[PDB]
Amino acid sequence: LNEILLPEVHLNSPIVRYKLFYYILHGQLPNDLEPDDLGPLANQNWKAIRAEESQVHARLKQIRVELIARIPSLRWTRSQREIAILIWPRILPILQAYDLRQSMQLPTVWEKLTQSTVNLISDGLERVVLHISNQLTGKPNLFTRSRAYSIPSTRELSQIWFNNEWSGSVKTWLMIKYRMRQLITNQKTGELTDLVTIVDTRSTLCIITPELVALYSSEHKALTYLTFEMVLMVTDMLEGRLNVSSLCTASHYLSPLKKRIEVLLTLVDDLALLMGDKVYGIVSSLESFVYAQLQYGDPVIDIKGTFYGFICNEILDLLTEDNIFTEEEANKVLLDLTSQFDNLSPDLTAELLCIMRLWGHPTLTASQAASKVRESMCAPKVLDFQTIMKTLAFFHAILINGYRRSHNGIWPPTTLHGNAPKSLIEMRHDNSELKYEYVLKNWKSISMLRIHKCFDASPDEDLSIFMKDKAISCPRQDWMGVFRRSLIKQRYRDANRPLPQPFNRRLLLNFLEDDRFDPIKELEYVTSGEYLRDPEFCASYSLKEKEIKATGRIFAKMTKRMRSCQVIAESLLANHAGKLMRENGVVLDQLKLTKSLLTMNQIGIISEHGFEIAACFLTTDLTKYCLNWRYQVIIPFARTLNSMYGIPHLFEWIHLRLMRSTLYVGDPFNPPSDPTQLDLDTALNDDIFIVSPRGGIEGLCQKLWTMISISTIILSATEANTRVMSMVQGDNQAIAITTRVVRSLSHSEKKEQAYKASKLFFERLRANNHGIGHHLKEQETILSSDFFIYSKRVFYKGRILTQALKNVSKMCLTADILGDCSQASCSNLATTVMRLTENGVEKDLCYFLNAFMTIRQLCYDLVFPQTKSLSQDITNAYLNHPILISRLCLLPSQLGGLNFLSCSRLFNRNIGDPLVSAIADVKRLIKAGCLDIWVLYNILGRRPGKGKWSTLAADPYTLNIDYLVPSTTFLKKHAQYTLMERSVNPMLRGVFSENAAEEEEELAQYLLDREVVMPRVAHVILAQSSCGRRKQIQGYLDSTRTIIRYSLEVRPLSAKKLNTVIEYNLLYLSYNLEIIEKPNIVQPFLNAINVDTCSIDIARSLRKLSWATLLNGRPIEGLETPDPIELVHGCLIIGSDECEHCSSGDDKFTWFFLPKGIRLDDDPASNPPIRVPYIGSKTDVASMAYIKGASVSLKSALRLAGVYIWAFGDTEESWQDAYELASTRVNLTLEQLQSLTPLPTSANLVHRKFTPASSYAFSSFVHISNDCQILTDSNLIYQQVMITGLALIETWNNPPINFSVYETTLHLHTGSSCCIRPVESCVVNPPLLPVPLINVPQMNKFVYDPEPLSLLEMEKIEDIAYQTRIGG
Amino acid sequence: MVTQIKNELSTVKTTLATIEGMMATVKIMDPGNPTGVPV
Amino acid sequence: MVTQIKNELSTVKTTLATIEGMMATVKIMDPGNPTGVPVDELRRSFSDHVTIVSGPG
Ligand SMILES: [Zn+2]
Ligand SMILES: [Zn+2]
């Protein structure tokens, strides 16, 4: 079992300084640590601690005696030796010297294997991209136009990835991490022998243990100790450095950044050696200096260089605080840091935001992290009553206006105050909109206005919230159980008290194992006032991983009851009241979110194709808002929300509970410094304690704070008589101040006028935020006339800047998931390469990089095996033949390979049928020369796997090919069944069924064992049936590493299942060996299929042959969709060129036009008019009768009935079967089902953070017209064609290109294409199998609703049906 | 003149109500004593 | 006599306006925990919700 629960491969936990100090003091390891450096650890009686933990001391003493033996000078005390002992942050400029090139062979073999495998596919991949460009444009330089310089192939990419700097360091640290993980696995198993590894390489001695790594370099005479977490950080950071440097070397777009990034790395490494842990302050300052340099080139003189100068001052402060540098030296260092940012395009200055994690993360301490939050909280804060009341009045106005914009335009139940004027009484009586100018005038009556109950909200409205695991704190009585037992044992012994019990319960498991769990009774904890009296309540922080900024270094955890209350309250706010305020533009739909962001950014960009419009953008950081919220400023908003929800007291819980409890930072290796403070309540406001925090916690009650911020923004906009468009998102808010300017004015003067107009609004916003207690400083706010920042992405002059290096810096050699399959890692690499394509990197380079790193990952997994196997025949077969590795890595995932990135994925995010795309890419590789046609014949003639009726319907488009699903998904599913069968909760009483798999198989047979098989329809109907709703609710489980470990513990796997989960990788490789080794003997009719056959025909044949055992030759319909690249035969028209498809017969095309004279980052008047480009079209019902407030079960039943009638027929028996299947989820009679069901015509069959699909640089100027095209598969096909054309236009002018001296035209002819096909469906196919006995959770409200229609609703639907029957 | 005093006492009513609501908000703003919205 | 209350009530109206002015410009201050006294000691506050009506109701 320990061979599944392997130690982490990447960093996922904070680095703790005192853990390293504990491990180096336990073994008496040599060190130059001052007494204060150790903190509380210096007062420990290490003798007793050494006496216990005998094995740990044995290993550490072994490492110490080896260090003393190899380096005799380590005995030299009082630092009379020349050897220097350096903690992590100070070994940055020496990491290149720690190289174990000799006495290390696995990285060498890995590099040679990757090189030899890449060398066999480079020329084929070049031919592949050449053919893609020739098809999509008609010219062979689609991908090389911007760079033609040097065009790096896959061989060049591999050569510069392996021969770069940091390559030797990344091989050395990969070996170190591999050996450390092996030793950790051995120690956990219990070998207790040979757990110390010595490499003793010349000039670099390294000793590896399961707990520490002792690294010594003879060149610098420096010795360092690294814990396992620090080893993972160093190897992640070095991999990121390698990736960033190699991408800068490869891409002509990022080529200017290579030298600047190298000098930045060198300078900050020496700065790290000089200062220590404070260099991350300099790194976080550079994070904002990127934006400061970005705003250094705006037209407005009064805003140019303000942020630049202020950040330079703050960096000088950070460099001179400790007097490490004098003023002259600090100024010189600042100049050196800044000179790497100047004379760069705006895109590159934003892609220098990759360096943030290139220097690792600071060593964290509980006291230092607690000091920051103890000062933001527990601090006196003066607030303005009037400012609070004005923003409360605007809050009421926005709530009323939103409730009017919904609910048929009527005011909420409201009670006017005695001070309300006649005008307010008439506006309430007439139910008219509250204009914001009116609110700003009468703010003393718009406020003091009690909105009564508006929502019938219930805590159990959403079940997904209860099924997500959140960290829960221990009961207050035992709060010291977080700390390591060794450190607290003696201080508890001296107090004559029992040792505190360790706490390991999880919120999810605790909720699952409750016999009596009622969400109403859960909320009664807060509503009744019991939370303010619970002596068990305890909240604590804990160190946050992968953070370098002082703020946000902790996250809080509460008790089970108060976490449940918090999630219930957040769900209540996010579902009913949060919906009512849309003054901001953030929505859950990402597509319309980025459309709104582009529209907001393009306010002031108007061309010449009176008065005009101008925009000045303001960006504010709200990170410290959570600590600065106070009850006295939120109580009125909380009270009105409580009134609207009917709860007497729910939402003002965070501050009230926090002021009465002492918080602390819970780190196992950071016990309290004073050993006499054994109780949390009596603790003082120092060390790791935060006594009576008056503020709130990050994330907790964020909806209320966001709503207050929106109200304040609207109040400030109204006070200044300025139009704005806020986009508040909790961390970063963006405000686009809008003003009217003369059209004839100069661009610089237009922006000056816009800034002058925005000055008053900014002053009002600052005053309002200070009034509600949030002091706005220079760091937080960023005023710019060109760009704003949203979700860590900058919107610069109608574009989203690339920041591709940040994405490439997190492209590592393994996924953090538990199964650790090759498929999961290759899929992760493919996803990151997709991000690279979307962020401006050459699409040709991205394709080559995807292939190269898939090969690299497979070779690494082959030569660095996670688990030892008795038989190495498969691994030797793959290792000794790199051609097999290349064939497997180039094979698409859907066919059993590891190539998870398709050729069409370079342009289209929405792929439709992935099997058709996979077949198209196989054809491309075959015709280029990468693969062979006999590989395709082997795949077609492959013997069908082990598939059931449930597998064809659970995930359509998939083949009956074994091992297609990773072991990670198997572990997630095992954890969800193990938690579901353990559940005893009143909710989920009937969700679990022992024969659920059999019932789902019978239902899938019912839907599929018909005359024609329609996997889309079966998938939809299953997902909207009772069995499918139970599957969905079981899939609501988190499936987290801790949850998976718990499932494996309480429900152990069988021996065969254990072995198959352990050796899934070897079994998968052995399974592929039957297809990627030699030409097998196949049936003869497969000779008809050629590389020239359309991918849709091959997909039809392949799905017919793959599921042959299941379907017995019957066809599969409704699945196939033409591949985007192969469907279109494009043509780019340049100057005197004439389209060759238009000139020869074909006349169907999607016309694209890019005007001439475009100059990005130049005067908007000169370039053609801008517009929001085509970014996609989501779902957009015309039912017989519209039902309002329909339950989820009712909607699911209507969906099921509509899909059933559309697909299988409209006879009376086809209606009876649909009625029964709906009756598995509702209680309607047959007549009202028929009446309420939406139209069974053209069913879409649609079935189920901020990542823009492109930079939208040149796509905002593109004209599109499908006037020469027919136009719901066709709609999706044409949307794909338009997206492909836009991406083609964008890659024609890559980010290096910023101009358009000529006007280009793209035709993209989809006609005369084999792939487009006619559509015939909706025939009558009756069920060849009787309806299965479907068990139904009748009592469960989340699955079945006994009363889905009211009496009035039933009367109305009956009247509608009768009127239609009589009226005709 | 009685109509004048009635019209002015209307303003007295509204300003007194404003003062009352403002003082109620202040009293309910003390974190020391948790408050509950009626119904 | 009714003429006498007419002028005196006008004096009242103005003060009520004035008090409102100052009340509208008051400052809501949060003491915070600057002293850093153990919560045990700082716990001098109601543990019970009180359903008092603010403004309308
Ligand atoms: Zn054409
Ligand atoms: Zn085709």
PDB file of C-alpha atoms in Angstrom, chain A residues 958-1074:
ATOM      1  CA  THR A 958     -14.249   6.576 -26.352  1.00  0.00           C
ATOM      2  CA  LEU A 959     -13.144   3.204 -27.693  1.00  0.00           C
ATOM      3  CA  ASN A 960     -13.262  -0.261 -26.143  1.00  0.00           C
ATOM      4  CA  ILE A 961      -9.525   0.037 -25.514  1.00  0.00           C
ATOM      5  CA  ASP A 962      -8.171  -1.093 -22.162  1.00  0.00           C
ATOM      6  CA  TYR A 963      -6.001   1.067 -19.879  1.00  0.00           C
ATOM      7  CA  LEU A 964      -7.300   4.297 -21.437  1.00  0.00           C
ATOM      8  CA  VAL A 965      -8.225   5.659 -17.996  1.00  0.00           C
ATOM      9  CA  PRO A 966      -5.401   6.423 -15.529  1.00  0.00           C
ATOM     10  CA  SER A 967      -5.057   4.903 -12.086  1.00  0.00           C
ATOM     11  CA  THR A 968      -5.602   8.393 -10.650  1.00  0.00           C
ATOM     12  CA  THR A 969      -9.247   8.297 -11.718  1.00  0.00           C
ATOM     13  CA  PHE A 970      -9.532   4.776 -10.316  1.00  0.00           C
ATOM     14  CA  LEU A 971      -8.233   5.982  -6.951  1.00  0.00           C
ATOM     15  CA  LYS A 972     -10.645   8.934  -6.989  1.00  0.00           C
ATOM     16  CA  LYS A 973     -13.572   6.626  -7.769  1.00  0.00           C
ATOM     17  CA  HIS A 974     -12.502   4.163  -5.073  1.00  0.00           C
ATOM     18  CA  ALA A 975     -12.355   6.983  -2.528  1.00  0.00           C
ATOM     19  CA  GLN A 976     -15.869   8.205  -3.523  1.00  0.00           C
ATOM     20  CA  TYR A 977     -17.534   4.739  -3.277  1.00  0.00           C
ATOM     21  CA  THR A 978     -15.655   4.101   0.010  1.00  0.00           C
ATOM     22  CA  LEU A 979     -16.952   7.371   1.442  1.00  0.00           C
ATOM     23  CA  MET A 980     -20.443   6.932  -0.034  1.00  0.00           C
ATOM     24  CA  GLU A 981     -20.933   3.412   1.323  1.00  0.00           C
ATOM     25  CA  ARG A 982     -19.663   4.694   4.685  1.00  0.00           C
ATOM     26  CA  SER A 983     -22.084   7.640   4.641  1.00  0.00           C
ATOM     27  CA  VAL A 984     -24.925   7.405   7.159  1.00  0.00           C
ATOM     28  CA  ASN A 985     -26.016  11.026   6.819  1.00  0.00           C
ATOM     29  CA  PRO A 986     -29.770  11.768   6.611  1.00  0.00           C
ATOM     30  CA  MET A 987     -29.020  13.516   3.311  1.00  0.00           C
ATOM     31  CA  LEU A 988     -27.596  10.774   1.057  1.00  0.00           C
ATOM     32  CA  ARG A 989     -29.792   8.255   2.879  1.00  0.00           C
ATOM     33  CA  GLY A 990     -30.779   6.476  -0.337  1.00  0.00           C
ATOM     34  CA  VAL A 991     -28.098   7.760  -2.724  1.00  0.00           C
ATOM     35  CA  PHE A 992     -25.864   4.714  -2.317  1.00  0.00           C
ATOM     36  CA  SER A 993     -26.974   1.336  -3.651  1.00  0.00           C
ATOM     37  CA  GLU A 994     -24.970  -1.884  -3.634  1.00  0.00           C
ATOM     38  CA  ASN A 995     -26.278  -2.821  -7.098  1.00  0.00           C
ATOM     39  CA  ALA A 996     -25.854   0.718  -8.460  1.00  0.00           C
ATOM     40  CA  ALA A 997     -23.343  -0.511 -11.041  1.00  0.00           C
ATOM     41  CA  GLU A 998     -25.718  -3.274 -12.159  1.00  0.00           C
ATOM     42  CA  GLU A 999     -28.637  -0.834 -12.362  1.00  0.00           C
ATOM     43  CA  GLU A1000     -26.558   1.582 -14.437  1.00  0.00           C
ATOM     44  CA  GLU A1001     -25.516  -1.277 -16.727  1.00  0.00           C
ATOM     45  CA  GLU A1002     -29.163  -2.279 -17.197  1.00  0.00           C
ATOM     46  CA  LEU A1003     -30.224   1.321 -17.877  1.00  0.00           C
ATOM     47  CA  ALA A1004     -27.373   1.837 -20.346  1.00  0.00           C
ATOM     48  CA  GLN A1005     -28.412  -1.396 -22.056  1.00  0.00           C
ATOM     49  CA  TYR A1006     -31.987  -0.087 -22.183  1.00  0.00           C
ATOM     50  CA  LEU A1007     -30.897   3.126 -23.903  1.00  0.00           C
ATOM     51  CA  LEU A1008     -28.195   1.524 -26.073  1.00  0.00           C
ATOM     52  CA  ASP A1009     -29.528  -1.925 -27.067  1.00  0.00           C
ATOM     53  CA  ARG A1010     -31.678  -0.395 -29.814  1.00  0.00           C
ATOM     54  CA  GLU A1011     -31.752  -0.477 -33.607  1.00  0.00           C
ATOM     55  CA  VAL A1012     -29.254   2.407 -33.771  1.00  0.00           C
ATOM     56  CA  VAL A1013     -26.869   3.188 -30.913  1.00  0.00           C
ATOM     57  CA  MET A1014     -26.718   6.851 -29.855  1.00  0.00           C
ATOM     58  CA  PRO A1015     -24.092   7.230 -27.106  1.00  0.00           C
ATOM     59  CA  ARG A1016     -24.758  10.966 -26.751  1.00  0.00           C
ATOM     60  CA  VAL A1017     -28.432  10.325 -26.001  1.00  0.00           C
ATOM     61  CA  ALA A1018     -27.596   7.498 -23.600  1.00  0.00           C
ATOM     62  CA  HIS A1019     -25.076   9.688 -21.772  1.00  0.00           C
ATOM     63  CA  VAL A1020     -27.566  12.540 -21.442  1.00  0.00           C
ATOM     64  CA  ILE A1021     -30.467  10.343 -20.326  1.00  0.00           C
ATOM     65  CA  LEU A1022     -28.274   8.534 -17.800  1.00  0.00           C
ATOM     66  CA  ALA A1023     -26.956  11.827 -16.425  1.00  0.00           C
ATOM     67  CA  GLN A1024     -30.534  13.082 -15.970  1.00  0.00           C
ATOM     68  CA  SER A1025     -31.918   9.845 -14.487  1.00  0.00           C
ATOM     69  CA  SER A1026     -32.032   8.807 -10.832  1.00  0.00           C
ATOM     70  CA  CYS A1027     -28.971   6.556 -11.247  1.00  0.00           C
ATOM     71  CA  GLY A1028     -27.136   9.422 -12.966  1.00  0.00           C
ATOM     72  CA  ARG A1029     -28.074  11.901 -10.220  1.00  0.00           C
ATOM     73  CA  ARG A1030     -26.729   9.464  -7.643  1.00  0.00           C
ATOM     74  CA  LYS A1031     -23.544   9.146  -9.710  1.00  0.00           C
ATOM     75  CA  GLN A1032     -23.293  12.946  -9.868  1.00  0.00           C
ATOM     76  CA  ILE A1033     -23.754  13.315  -6.114  1.00  0.00           C
ATOM     77  CA  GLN A1034     -21.120  10.639  -5.503  1.00  0.00           C
ATOM     78  CA  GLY A1035     -18.899  12.578  -7.911  1.00  0.00           C
ATOM     79  CA  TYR A1036     -19.406  15.683  -5.780  1.00  0.00           C
ATOM     80  CA  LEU A1037     -16.829  14.184  -3.398  1.00  0.00           C
ATOM     81  CA  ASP A1038     -13.481  15.961  -3.379  1.00  0.00           C
ATOM     82  CA  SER A1039     -11.163  12.941  -3.857  1.00  0.00           C
ATOM     83  CA  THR A1040      -8.172  14.577  -2.161  1.00  0.00           C
ATOM     84  CA  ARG A1041      -4.847  12.924  -1.289  1.00  0.00           C
ATOM     85  CA  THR A1042      -5.868  12.797   2.378  1.00  0.00           C
ATOM     86  CA  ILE A1043      -9.308  11.471   1.408  1.00  0.00           C
ATOM     87  CA  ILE A1044      -7.727   8.831  -0.842  1.00  0.00           C
ATOM     88  CA  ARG A1045      -5.382   7.776   1.966  1.00  0.00           C
ATOM     89  CA  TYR A1046      -8.331   7.516   4.358  1.00  0.00           C
ATOM     90  CA  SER A1047     -10.258   5.390   1.856  1.00  0.00           C
ATOM     91  CA  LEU A1048      -7.278   3.076   1.356  1.00  0.00           C
ATOM     92  CA  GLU A1049      -6.893   2.751   5.134  1.00  0.00           C
ATOM     93  CA  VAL A1050     -10.494   2.115   6.203  1.00  0.00           C
ATOM     94  CA  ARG A1051     -11.245   0.099   3.027  1.00  0.00           C
ATOM     95  CA  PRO A1052      -8.056  -1.680   1.937  1.00  0.00           C
ATOM     96  CA  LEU A1053      -7.678  -2.765  -1.662  1.00  0.00           C
ATOM     97  CA  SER A1054      -7.488  -6.437  -2.545  1.00  0.00           C
ATOM     98  CA  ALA A1055      -4.122  -7.974  -3.386  1.00  0.00           C
ATOM     99  CA  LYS A1056      -4.897  -8.155  -7.110  1.00  0.00           C
ATOM    100  CA  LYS A1057      -6.273  -4.605  -7.095  1.00  0.00           C
ATOM    101  CA  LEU A1058      -3.239  -3.455  -5.100  1.00  0.00           C
ATOM    102  CA  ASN A1059      -0.900  -4.990  -7.677  1.00  0.00           C
ATOM    103  CA  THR A1060      -2.810  -3.600 -10.658  1.00  0.00           C
ATOM    104  CA  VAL A1061      -2.845  -0.082  -9.193  1.00  0.00           C
ATOM    105  CA  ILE A1062       0.882  -0.358  -8.465  1.00  0.00           C
ATOM    106  CA  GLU A1063       1.845  -1.718 -11.907  1.00  0.00           C
ATOM    107  CA  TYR A1064      -0.679   0.168 -14.047  1.00  0.00           C
ATOM    108  CA  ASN A1065       2.204   1.864 -15.867  1.00  0.00           C
ATOM    109  CA  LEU A1066       3.906  -1.418 -16.763  1.00  0.00           C
ATOM    110  CA  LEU A1067       0.590  -2.993 -17.773  1.00  0.00           C
ATOM    111  CA  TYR A1068      -0.250   0.012 -19.963  1.00  0.00           C
ATOM    112  CA  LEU A1069       3.129  -0.150 -21.706  1.00  0.00           C
ATOM    113  CA  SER A1070       2.725  -3.903 -22.216  1.00  0.00           C
ATOM    114  CA  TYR A1071      -0.740  -3.273 -23.670  1.00  0.00           C
ATOM    115  CA  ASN A1072       0.705  -0.786 -26.169  1.00  0.00           C
ATOM    116  CA  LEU A1073       3.480  -3.227 -27.076  1.00  0.00           C
ATOM    117  CA  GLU A1074       0.930  -5.187 -29.125  1.00  0.00           C
TER     118      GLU A1074
END
